[PDB]
UniProtKB/Swiss-Prot annotation, chain A:
<dbReference type="GO" id="GO:0043161">
    <property type="term" value="P:proteasome-mediated ubiquitin-dependent protein catabolic process"/>
</dbReference>
<dbReference type="InterPro" id="IPR023333">
    <property type="entry name" value="Proteasome_suB-type"/>
</dbReference>
<dbReference type="InterPro" id="IPR033811">
    <property type="entry name" value="Proteasome_beta_3"/>
</dbReference>
<dbReference type="GO" id="GO:0005634">
    <property type="term" value="C:nucleus"/>
</dbReference>
<dbReference type="Pfam" id="PF00227">
    <property type="entry name" value="Proteasome"/>
</dbReference>
UniProtKB/Swiss-Prot annotation, chain E:
<feature type="modified residue" description="Phosphotyrosine">
    <location>
        <position position="57"/>
    </location>
</feature>
<dbReference type="GO" id="GO:0019774">
    <property type="term" value="C:proteasome core complex, beta-subunit complex"/>
</dbReference>
<protein>
    <recommendedName>
        <fullName>Proteasome subunit beta type-4</fullName>
    </recommendedName>
</protein>
<dbReference type="GO" id="GO:0005839">
    <property type="term" value="C:proteasome core complex"/>
</dbReference>
<keyword id="KW-0007">Acetylation</keyword>
Curated annotation (Swiss-Prot), chain F:
<comment type="function">
    <text>Component of the 20S core proteasome complex involved in the proteolytic degradation of most intracellular proteins. This complex plays numerous essential roles within the cell by associating with different regulatory particles. Associated with two 19S regulatory particles, forms the 26S proteasome and thus participates in the ATP-dependent degradation of ubiquitinated proteins.</text>
</comment>
<protein>
    <recommendedName>
        <fullName>Proteasome subunit alpha type-7</fullName>
    </recommendedName>
</protein>
<comment type="similarity">
    <text>Belongs to the peptidase T1A family.</text>
</comment>
<comment type="subunit">
    <text>The 26S proteasome consists of a 20S proteasome core and two 19S regulatory subunits. The 20S proteasome core is a barrel-shaped complex made of 28 subunits that are arranged in four stacked rings. The two outer rings are each formed by seven alpha subunits, and the two inner rings are formed by seven beta subunits. The proteolytic activity is exerted by three beta-subunits PSMB5, PSMB6 and PSMB7. PSMA7 interacts directly with the PSMG1-PSMG2 heterodimer which promotes 20S proteasome assembly. Interacts with HIF1A. Interacts with RAB7A. Interacts with PRKN. Interacts with ABL1 and ABL2.</text>
</comment>
Curated annotation (Swiss-Prot), chains G, I:
<dbReference type="GO" id="GO:0043161">
    <property type="term" value="P:proteasome-mediated ubiquitin-dependent protein catabolic process"/>
</dbReference>
<keyword id="KW-0865">Zymogen</keyword>
<dbReference type="InterPro" id="IPR000243">
    <property type="entry name" value="Pept_T1A_subB"/>
</dbReference>
<dbReference type="GO" id="GO:1990111">
    <property type="term" value="C:spermatoproteasome complex"/>
</dbReference>
<keyword id="KW-0391">Immunity</keyword>
Length: 204, 219, 197, 213, 216, 123, 199, 201, 199, 198
């Protein structure tokens, strides 16, 4: 349908004290590819990121309306946003459009600013927030991204085991998607620091 | 999606499952359903997930001030009229299927709200995709004013039948007891499925990932 | 179907467009100018539906001229593309949808040359080279082979002609005359109009 | 009017080991949102060295299997021998084409051992195109099964790691857990598991429990 | 396909120890009208097997005339063989499948029960050709209503007697009458056993209407 | 329709029908041809003219193609059927193959008709 | 869905069934389709159950106001025109059809069919998807000057006859006898449904 | 799907991708699209996979029945015409098949094309598939009939690798087959991505 | 279009109206919809008038042959299955619906509805576009063991009730009493139609 | 859309056709031969649906070769056109309709040159000049001005080039190369292939 125009994939897995999010770099129109540098992950502020997929028109449009509400929320508050608070914000933005709804599946991942706690969540076209204790993925290949993270995920994983798990889940699942590929950007959100890496992937 | 409730002598219990699915796959296994309205009044959604979510949000919000403005107990029949007028305003555009039950000054009462807005009073029913499995179980074994323990054993088996008899119904069973003395929440009261284990483990050694670019930003 | 092409050199941006404007079975205007000047170093290439091509691009033309006169300085290439996308995205859900395909060519005193790809759905992506129309399939593949960030404009114009001569071989529509211009630190420089006697 | 087809769900897996070939599928038969029964084995044994899976519209899965079994006897009576795994695959290709105008709606997966004792996995499509591969999948969860077998079985996308040919002990545990993970996220998979392992000595069946949800 | 009218209702069947019970309502339905209140929806095949169906009853009488003569032709042959309950279930699978390729499918849903040589058989076919074997079966909304009722009993008690079976049928016949608007009060409970098929006459069930006083 | 077996076996296996057909061939007019180096020459002798019969319709030398000609001896009625049907198939071969027709191709396209129509039912 | 009302000397008898089924499945098998608009003024719900319950409250909102302003029970003709104008004006978005009946101190018991947007007075009125099949009994078996006991049986026999033939009708028979001294509410259990020819 | 062939002094070179996808999911990456008809005769595939596998084997059947009959080693021209006529009788029934026939004969290394509607063409350079237009660009640039054996491999290699990069339905490993007078021979099989790393550097 | 048949001890009474209207205009207001298939075997025409008259002749063609071969009147069950198989097989191009009734020396008077392609035996059967509204009278007023005089009135009262409510039914009532001694044909003029409640 | 043109001179018939065969957005074969030889002095020009163009014209090609070999002499130009119309009219009501546009060019030893126009509906009309395709609108008008029965082929070829150069100006599709031949008493004579070194 319309969600299959630009394709795309977004993956977020929860570790022990840290959380990792990953999405591919590909941007294309149906059978026509465009560019390799496309970015599906935008910063929400410290230790909080959001993934986006589906029609890229709404990907870039909702990202501006989320940054519309993000900055206004951060300027009014004296404290940073919690990842659980942002989940409900995306639910209101998608529900007010209920007649005209946007086409996208936002994926929110980050750490609880309280102390170390990781938090993950994802929504749907209808704007239904959902909290899972393992991982969240979205895209046209999301049926493929399940089986990788279903078996590989563990209750507690250090940044060493977390990055190795989410990276292998991306490289294996995205290669079976025709509209997805061309590099994978992986972000590691830890308590002390934040690590960004670009994986070596096939061009196909 | 299997949701049901039963009214017994001393109160009412609303059962629901923990599993939510999106059309090809299970979205969340432990996902909660029953929402909060009043201390003695609870509801549970069905049909469209976000529509049933946002409708109970506007219902719990409207009923919250009704409890704050009146300072008294809330009527269960007041909740149902709020829900259907929203469905009437949109002419059935909202696919929210809602069941409402609780205990008020009059006594334990259970209602039903169809996404088209029709409301019906009734001692017991079920809604969702697996409603026909729970209705048949509740129809045969129901008795007027059953003991609290007798109603607990029956409704848990009703949700169990609604789960085993539906593809969209699974996970644990969340039952919430509401009595004239007070309401109590039971999380994951029933777990009919034992096999929570797996036969192998997957671990990765450091250095097995083909990393190309690497950078570190301190915080 | 009209054709567009552009190439981002290290200090330069090389763009080209077809000058043919046709209707029904005939070509009415073969010298038609598809190139619109947004700013001094910023050009624009607009093709699409015959009615939406001229109308919607003239809206962008003055809207960019609005910014430059109000603040005394023109939009940057990055700022220009992002404002044109929201203009196209706002009319997407209106009763007058605009079918257009735009390439933004511009040069900045700091980030240097910039080339931007835009579809009719208002999806903006930066690319070293891009093309529109059905002829984009017969051309961009050649750019995949011969493109390097260090290429000199002298060889780029020669490789641009090699791509456009493919439009006279495989590509069905005639398109006799092409217009070619370049953008650099010294401003807009016109190039010899491609002519096939 | 009349809908000639309906999606009955299910999942079928086949993997070709060095000396062995493993084929497994679930027992769940469901149409729409309702369960017909929790035991409906899709795996059908053609010969001792060949096992065919069927995933798709159930009415075509029953008839097409009876047509194949009818042509198995035509061969053996004529040629005085059993069909090879590669001969059965190329046969059904022409069988599926005979309907090319009104194609059978099914996803067929054939697996077993060839004359060399090596596993041969054959994945089909309703129009009859086929290929040989080490491991294939099919059904509603087909998108789920493929990435897991690419990393684990295929050793793909892994740098500087020892590549050991597939072992039967691991191949069993890999097929079990991918379905345990499938039964989690697949509404059409679960309730039981039947694993048919074809080796040089013979076929050995197994039964594995799964969640009832 | 075109327009059949002559609509039917739900049919239930289940397995118990040494026999099979299959019950169905006697009401034929035309559109929203309940027209023919006396109809035999359960047909006997030889001694050891029995048949019932749903959907178009006009197509069911045609399946009476086809399958009936074919079964009688075997009794006329006298070779010492009888159609097995799997054979009737198999023949109806292909007979209903043969109507889809000619673009003239018959609207019906059939259930084949039987007991032979200590083997209790219950089976299901469909216009769409879906066929399988299950210990408890139902058609229409019975698969939504009466099916999970029997699954809960078969999981707790896989072995059921002849009395326990009929008691569960009446309780399922009681529930189906409640929640199925197109169902009807009068029904026939037919049971096949080691003595053969025995079809009971018109029956009813005591209904509990106390919900009327509990709602008000 | 008329359906029967015409040509049947004898005690010796010989076919009286085919043998009598070859006797009519022997009673035909004398025709000859010889392969040269780059050339071929066909000839036939027709003595029947008292100045009455026209010489345009008598010709027994026929061309199947630009590169293929032929001459016949036998019943003049049966030749007109074979020559026409050979030319229809010879040009139908140029429809299937852009290259011209090799003489051996068409000779199989001809002798095969004498095979079928001899053993065919009622022919 | 079957609703029935019969006028007699001392009042009217307005019956209804308890079955409410959306589609082919029963939502509730016990439901009261008689929604009081006043003490002696009642409304028999039919057609779309969602639109009928909305009009019943919008009608009660206007009738309670008209009743309190006059400080006297409104006439049955007053309550009928309220439903009609709400029906006729809003028939675009409202497919519901109602039957207004009650008792007043002027003409006594009255029954006004509001179905389809028109208004007419009748001695006996029937509505719903099941009222089409009962035309035979209500026409021939109707006699002038029937006692209140005969009117209860005449109304019950026709409703019980609809419940047999109508697939969307069933449950228990609700009877409301509206007279000058008050209103009597009775419920007929499934065992008390009058038995007719069973073949 | 990207398939291309061209003829020059040293004979025909056929290059194709390995990937065939259904919808958004890739069915198989390792699919071998090139059909083997005769030792010296080489076919291709385009469009529907089953339509090619069915009809190209009928062409291989006709080519073998021909060589068993007259022993003349059927020319590429006769093979291309017989394949087109078989698609004409069923025209309009929904059969979609593209293909290209390559081989050498007494005339030379002929190159022909057969469409789904029966279009039969002849020329120096052909390509088909969803990525055919992406192939025409690189192939035409820097091509002459006088190209050598080694120089033409670099043209055929860069043809698939750069064309499959811009196509979502084209990919897998590059399968390139040179044609000679004795017969075609397998040259190299190499992943597109592995060659992408050499071109970027 | 209304057809009716009622079985009793000595035979059956098969009634019909005379009104035949294609669309909203009456083609003929006096027409006999009872077409004899035999002496005691009759067929009540309903549904499409063009398809019913074609089947009536195709049925009579087969029944006369079956009757002459046996040299005895065919059973009523024989004549019913002729119409049914012609109906069920040809229902693609034939929308007509017929009601077969007659008398035989075996079981006596019989009435077999052939409508929609099925076959069933009934003590009384009604068909046509007007038979849907008379279900109330025929169900409640039916009593076992009615005299031939009561059966003529019971059949007439229900047909005259359909003629009032059915817009496509009217004209004069045709009655045929089929007994063992013969068949009596009577016509009820518009003045002799039984008067019912007029208000 | 493919293009055809023909001109009937006093002793000659001058015809021309586009050599381009294209599919989708690309031109696959630019040298393609649209000219089919029916007889010695009789040519044929067939354009239309890509599938019906080659298939149906080859049927006419051999059917004319059927007549010439059976009777020893070819059809006349008038006899050829009238037999081709019946062939196209018979398949008009069949399940395989043929969309084609044909020009028949031939010379007779008595009536002289003959040019015949035929549509996809098999309507045969004799005309001194005719053309097919969308380019027929941009060309035939020029012939209306410059045509005379006494024109010499030397000026006709020059005027033919003037008409075909209009296809490179107003007419949208490229069509780089055109094939031109002439028919006269001396048989088929090829002319310089029109080439545009763009």
């Amino acid at each position: 349908s319309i969600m299959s125009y630009n394709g795309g994939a977004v993956m977020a897995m929860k570790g022990k004290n840290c959380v990792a999010i990953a999405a591919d770099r590909r941007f294309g129109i149906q059978a026509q590819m465009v560019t390799t540098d496309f970015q599906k992950i935008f910063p929400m502020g410290d230790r909080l990121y959001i993934g986006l997929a589906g029609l890229a028109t709404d990907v870039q449009t909702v990202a501006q309306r989320l940054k519309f509400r993000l900055n206004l929320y951060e300027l009014k508050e004296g404290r940073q946003i919690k990842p659980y608070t942002l989940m409900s914000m995306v639910a209101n933005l998608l529900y007010e459009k209920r007649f005209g709804p946007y086409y996208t599946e936002p994926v929110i991942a980050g750490l609880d600013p309280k102390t170390f706690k990781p938090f993950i969540c994802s929504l749907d076209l209808i704007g239904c927030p959902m909290v899972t204790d393992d991982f969240v993925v979205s895209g046209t290949c999301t049926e493929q991204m399940y089986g990788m993270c279903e078996s590989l995920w563990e209750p507690n994983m250090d940044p060493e085991h977390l990055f190795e798990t989410i990276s292998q889940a991306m490289l294996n699942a995205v290669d079976r998607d025709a509209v997805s590929g061309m590099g994978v950007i992986v972000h590691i959100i830890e308590k002390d620091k934040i690590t960004t890496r670009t994986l070596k992937a096939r061009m196909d | 999606t299997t949701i049901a409730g039963l009214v017994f002598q001393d109160g009412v219990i609303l059962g629901a499952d923990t599993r939510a699915t999106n059309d090809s796959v299970v979205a969340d296994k432990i996902c909660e359903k029953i929402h909060f309205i009043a201390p003695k009044i609870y509801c549970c959604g069905a049909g469209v997930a976000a529509d049933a979510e946002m409708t109970t949000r506007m219902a719990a919000s409207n009923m919250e001030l009704h409890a704050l403005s009146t300072g008294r107990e809330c009527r269960v029949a007041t909740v149902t009229r709020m829900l259907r007028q929203t469905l009437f305003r949109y002419q059935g555009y909202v696919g929210a299927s809602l069941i409402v039950g609780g205990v008020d000054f009059t006594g334990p009462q259970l209602y039903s709200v169809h996404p088209h807005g029709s409301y019906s009073r009734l001692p017991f029913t079920a809604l969702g995709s697996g409603q026909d499995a729970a209705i048949a179980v509740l129809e045969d074994r129901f008795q007027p004013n059953m003991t609290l323990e007798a109603a607990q054993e029956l409704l848990v088996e009703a949700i169990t039948a609604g789960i085993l008899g539906d593809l969209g119904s699974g996970g644990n069973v969340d039952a919430c007891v509401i009595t004239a003395a007070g309401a109590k929440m039971l999380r994951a009261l029933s777990s009919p499925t034992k096999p929570i284990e797996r036969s192998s483990q997957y671990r990765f050694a450091p250095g097995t990932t083909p990393v190309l670019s690497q950078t570190v930003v301190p915080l | 179907m009209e054709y567009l092409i552009g190439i981002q050199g290290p200090d330069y941006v090389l763009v080209a467009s077809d000058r043919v404007a046709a209707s029904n079975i005939v070509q009415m205007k073969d010298d038609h100018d598809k190139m619109f000047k947004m700013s001094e170093k910023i050009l624009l290439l607009c093709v699409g539906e015959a009615g939406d091509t001229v109308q919607f691009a003239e809206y962008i033309q003055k809207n960019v001229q609005l910014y430059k006169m109000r603040n005394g300085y023109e939009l940057s290439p990055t700022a220009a593309a992002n404002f044109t996308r929201r203009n196209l995205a706002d009319y997407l859900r209106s009763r007058t949808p605009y079918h257009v395909n735009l390439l933004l060519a511009g040069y900045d005193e700091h980030e240097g040359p910039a080339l931007y790809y835009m579809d009719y759905l208002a999806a903006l992506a930066k690319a070293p080279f891009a093309a529109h129309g059905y002829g984009a399939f017969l051309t961009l593949s050649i750019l995949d082979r011969y493109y390097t960030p260090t290429i000199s404009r002298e060889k780029a114009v020669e490789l641009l002609r090699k791509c456009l001569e493919e439009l006279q071989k495989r590509f069905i529509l005639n398109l006799p005359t092409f217009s070619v211009r370049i953008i650099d630190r010294n401003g807009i420089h016109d190039l010899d109009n491609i002519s096939f006697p | 009017r009349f809908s000639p087809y309906a999606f009955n769900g299910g999942t079928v897996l086949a993997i070709a080991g060095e000396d062995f070939s493993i084929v497994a599928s679930d027992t769940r038969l469901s149409e729409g949102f309702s369960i017909h029964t929790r035991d409906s084995p899709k795996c059908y044994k053609l010969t001792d060295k060949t096992v065919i899976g069927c995933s798709g519209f159930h009415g075509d899965c029953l008839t097409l299997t009876k047509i194949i079994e009818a042509r198995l006897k035509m061969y053996k009576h004529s040629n005085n021998k059993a069909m090879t795994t590669g001969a059965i695959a190329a046969m059904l290709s022409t069988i599926l084409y005979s309907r090319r105008f009104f194609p059978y709606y099914v996803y067929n997966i054939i697996g077993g051992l060839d004359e060399e004792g090596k596993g041969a996995v054959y994945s089909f499509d309703p129009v009859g195109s086929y290929q040989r591969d080490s491991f294939k999948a099919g059904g509603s969860a087909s998108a789920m099964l493929q990435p897991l077998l690419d990393n684990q079985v295929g050793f793909k996308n892994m740098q500087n790691v020892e590549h050991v040919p597939l072992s039967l002990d691991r191949a069993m545990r890999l097929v079990k857990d991918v379905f345990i993970s499938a039964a989690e996220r697949d509404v059409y998979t679960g309730d039981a598991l039947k694993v048919c392992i074809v080796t040089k000595e013979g076929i050995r069946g197994e039964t594995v429990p799964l969640r009832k949800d | 396909t075109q327009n059949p009218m002559v609509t039917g209702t739900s049919v239930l069947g289940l397995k118990f120890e040494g026999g099979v019970v299959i019950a169905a309502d006697m009401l034929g339905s035309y559109g929203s009208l309940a027209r023919f209140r006396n109809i035999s929806r359960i047909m006997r095949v030889n001694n050891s097997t029995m048949l019932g169906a749903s959907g178009d009853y006009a197509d069911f009488q045609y399946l009476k005339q086809v399958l009936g003569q074919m079964v009688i032709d075997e009794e006329l042959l006298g070779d010492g063989h009888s159609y097995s309950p799997k054979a009737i279930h198999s023949w109806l699978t292909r007979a209903m499948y043969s109507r889809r390729s000619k673009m003239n499918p018959l609207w019906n849903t059939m259930v084949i029960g039987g007991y032979a040589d200590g083997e209790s058989f219950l089976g299901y076919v469909d216009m769409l050709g879906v066929a399988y074997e299950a210990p408890s079966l139902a058609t229409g909304y019975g698969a939504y209503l009466a099916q999970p009722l029997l699954r809960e009993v078969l999981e707790k008690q896989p072995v059921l007697s002849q009395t326990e079976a009929r008691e569960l049928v009446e309780r399922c016949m009681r529930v189906l009458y409640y929640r199925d608007a197109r169902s009807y009060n009068r029904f026939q409970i037919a049971t096949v056993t080691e003595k053969g098929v025995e079809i009971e006459g018109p029956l009813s069930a005591e209904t509990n209407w106390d919900i009327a006083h509990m709602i008000s | 329709s008329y359906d029967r077996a015409i040509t049947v076996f004898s005690p010796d296996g010989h076919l009286f029908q085919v043998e009598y057909a070859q006797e009519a061939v022997k009673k035909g007019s004398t025709a000859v041809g010889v392969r040269g180096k780059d050339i071929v020459v066909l000839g036939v002798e027709k003595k029947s003219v008292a100045k009455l019969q026209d010489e345009r319709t008598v010709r027994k030398i026929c061309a199947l193609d630009d590169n293929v000609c032929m001459a016949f001896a036998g019943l003049t009625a049966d030749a007109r059927i074979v020559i026409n049907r050979a030319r229809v198939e010879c040009q139908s071969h140029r429809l299937t193959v852009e290259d011209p027709v090799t003489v051996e191709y068409i000779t199989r396209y001809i002798a095969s008709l004498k095979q079928r129509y001899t053993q065919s039912n009622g022919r | 869905t079957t609703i029935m009302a019969v006028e007699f000397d001392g009042g009217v008898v307005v019956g209804s069934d308890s079955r409410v089924s959306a589609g082919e499945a029963v939502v509730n098998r016990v439901f009261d389709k008689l929604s009081p608009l006043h003490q002696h003024i009642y409304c028999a719900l039919s057609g779309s159950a969602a639109d009928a319950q909305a009009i019943a409250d919008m009608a009660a909102y206007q009738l309670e106001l008209h009743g309190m302003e006059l400080e006297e029970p409104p006439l049955v003709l007053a309550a009928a025109n309220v439903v009609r104008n709400i029906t006729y004006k809003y028939r675009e978005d409202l497919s519901a059809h109602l039957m207004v009946a009650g008792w007043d101190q002027r003409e006594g018991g009255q029954v006004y069919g509001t179905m389809s947007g028109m208004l007419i007075r009748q001695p006996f009125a029937i509505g719903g998807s099941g009222s089409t099949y009962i035309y035979g009994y209500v026409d021939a078996a109707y006699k002038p000057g029937m006692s209140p006991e005969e009117c209860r049986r005449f109304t019950t026999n026709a409703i019980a006859l609809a419940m047999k033939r109508d697939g969307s009708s069933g449950g228990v028979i609700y009877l409301a006898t509206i007279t000058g001294a008050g209103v009597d509410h009775r419920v007929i259990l499934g065992d008390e449904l009058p038995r007719f020819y069973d073949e | 799907t990207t398939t291309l062939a061209f003829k020059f002094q040293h004979g025909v070179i056929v290059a194709v991708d390995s990937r065939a996808s259904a919808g958004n999911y890739i069915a198989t990456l390792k699919v071998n699209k090139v059909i083997e008809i005769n030792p010296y005769l080489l076919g291709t595939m385009s469009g529907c996979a089953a339509d090619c596998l069915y009809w190209e084997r009928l062409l291989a059947k006709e080519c073998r029945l021909y060589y068993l009959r007259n022993g003349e080693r059927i020319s590429v021209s006769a093979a291309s015409k017989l394949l087109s006529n078989m698609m004409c009788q069923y025209r309009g029934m929904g059969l979609s098949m593209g293909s290209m026939i390559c081989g050498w004969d007494k005339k030379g290394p002929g190159l022909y094309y057969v469409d789904e509607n029966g279009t039969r063409l002849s020329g120096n350079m052909f390509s088909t598939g969803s990525g055919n237009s992406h192939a025409y660009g690189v192939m035409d640039s820097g091509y002459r009939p006088d190209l050598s054996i080694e120089e033409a491999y670099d043209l055929g290699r860069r043809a698939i690798v750069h064309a499959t990069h811009r196509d979502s339905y084209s990919g897998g490993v590059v399968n390139m087959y040179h044609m000679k007078e004795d017969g075609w021979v397998k040259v190299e099989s190499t992943d597109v991505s592995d060659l992408m790393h050499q071109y970027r550097e």
